[PDB]
């Protein structure tokens, strides 16, 4: 519930949150597609400005090694249709969240992007809150009797959730394990064009940062001021592969 | 061109009522919060209301419930402000004030100004 | 009813000085105060917002600052398209109210 009424300059909260719990890995002679939503080519209908909604529109593109997974506020670039970059946190306000376009990948003739592909995505809704800001589309007035001696402002109705990836275990794993490529889904099956071979990997279970902490000076009683704090995070990885040889 | 077009001055005899209107204050979809202020040359300038288009909410002051009057219309148009029974102390300069898309405080765009005599 | 009682109704300067207008607030209004400039056979027109916010096309030159019950606005270096009548505005809580007038005139 609440509350009341303190629509105001600056009503941002700090605020922390886990997000949702992805695994998956896939193999191919050519890199992976993955798809997001952008601020789409203007325009759709005509004409005019300014502050209104950003146009949509699904772009798909190459996952090139360190861009953003799925979060828990869908595959979207943030930088572009988030402008007062703090509606999502840190690490994704300023980038893209790419979710790989599993339908156009095993859709192409040849199929060298998906030799196979794993994957595993859960996520609940940990908590709800609403935006701060003016409405940009307010709710019908056929929908809400409007009030109320006082209330009379129409609350914020932009909801969003904050994501929870649950629980991670061993059992859940998806690698540690070997895959034998025994029959692929497109064409090519197996065949390494090029001789290079494009792995991709997402694994947000072994997503543990770690905080450092050093210290400046070491007063007589304790002082927060004596340490710096820092965030550091690692990830460790061992490719094995296994090829056959072919003549043509 | 972000501007309020008003009705224009009328002079009108004391018992009468008149009906002042705004313009490009008020559209579907879009959200604003239209406001009226009254400019006596004595008390300075006096809150009238706080009217919401898209919607047709009405606050008032009690100085002015029972004197002032509210409408919007949402297609075009709003806002109208009509005063009932004219006195001596309603000869004043009104505005249709409109904060860009809503909230109180601000009013960064202001009508023309309408100058109203009632007197005989 | 919360009462905006400005200082001086009348104030006096020069050109390139500094200028300083205050507004007292009879109750805790937080930062829920805007400024106005209105000049002769005009409308007013909005300068600060939020206490210390100026809105797009006021110049640096006006600065606001204050919180809870007392406002004051700042001119920095003067020009002569600075003459004209200042308000100051209280949006807390219903009715809002203004007050008096201040005139800044030059001692060119």
């Known amino acids: 519930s609440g509350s009341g009424g303190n629509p105001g300059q600056d009503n941002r909260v700090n605020v922390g949150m886990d997000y949702k719990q992805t695994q998956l890995c896939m193999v191919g002679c050519a890199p992976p597609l993955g798809e997001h939503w952008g601020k789409g080519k203007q325009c759709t209908n005509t004409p005019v400005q300014a502050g209104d909604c950003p146009p949509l529109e699904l772009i798909t593109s190459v996952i090139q090694d360190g861009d953003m997974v799925d979060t828990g506020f869908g595959a979207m670039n943030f930088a572009d249709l988030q402008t007062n970059k703090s509606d999502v946190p840190i690490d994704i306000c300023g980038t893209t969240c790419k979710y790989p376009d599993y339908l156009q990948m095993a859709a192409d003739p040849y199929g060298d992007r998906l030799f196979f592909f794993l994957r595993k995505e859960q996520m609940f809704a940990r908590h709800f809150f609403n935006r701060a800001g003016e409405v940009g589309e307010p709710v019908p007035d056929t929908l809400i009797i409007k009030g109320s001696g006082n209330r009379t402002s129409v609350g914020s109705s932009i909801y969003v959730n904050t994501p929870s990836g649950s629980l991670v275990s061993s059992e859940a794993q998806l690698f540690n394990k070997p895959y034998w490529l025994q029959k692929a889904q497109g064409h090519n099956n197996g065949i390494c064009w090029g001789n290079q071979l494009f792995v991709t990997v997402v694994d947000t279970t072994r997503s543990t940062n770690m905080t450092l902490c050093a210290s400046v000076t070491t007063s007589s009683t304790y002082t927060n001021s004596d340490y710096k704090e820092y965030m550091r995070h690692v990830e460790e990885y061992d490719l094995q592969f296994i090829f056959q040889l072919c003549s043509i | 061109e972000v501007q309020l077009q008003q009705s224009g001055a009328e002079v009108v005899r004391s018992g009468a009522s008149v009906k002042l209107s705004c313009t490009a204050s008020?559209?579907?979809?879009?959200?604003?919060?239209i406001h009226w202020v009254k400019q006596r040359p004595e008390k300075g300038l006096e809150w009238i209301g706080a009217?919401?288009?898209?919607?047709?909410?009405?606050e008032y002051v009690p100085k002015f419930q029972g004197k002032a009057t509210m409408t919007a219309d949402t297609s075009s148009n709003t806002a109208y402000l009509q005063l009932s029974s004219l006195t001596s102390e309603d000869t004043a300069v009104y505005y249709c004030?409109?904060?860009?898309?809503?909230?109180?405080?601000?009013?960064?765009?202001w009508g023309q100004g309408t100058l109203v005599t009632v007197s005989a | 009813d919360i009462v905006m009682t400005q200082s001086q109704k009348f104030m006096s300067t020069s050109v390139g000085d500094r200028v300083s207008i205050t507004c007292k607030a009879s109750?805790?209004?937080?930062?829920?105060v805007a400024w106005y400039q209105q000049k002769p056979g005009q409308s007013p027109k909005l300068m600060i917002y939020?206490?210390?916010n100026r809105y797009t096309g006021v110049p640096d030159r006006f600065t606001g600052s204050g919180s809870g019950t007392d406002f004051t606005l700042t001119i920095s270096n003067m020009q002569s398209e600075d003459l004209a009548d200042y308000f100051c505005?209280?949006?807390?809580?219903?009715?809002?109210?203004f007050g008096a007038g201040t005139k800044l005139e030059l001692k060119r």
């Open positions: 109750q805790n209004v937080g930062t829920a």
């Open positions: 008020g559209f579907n979809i879009k959200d604003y919060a």
């Open positions: 004030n409109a904060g860009h898309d809503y909230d109180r405080g601000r009013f960064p765009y």
């Open positions: 505005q209280q949006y807390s809580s219903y009715p809002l109210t």
């Open positions: 009217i919401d288009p898209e919607y047709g909410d009405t």
């Open positions: 939020f206490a210390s």
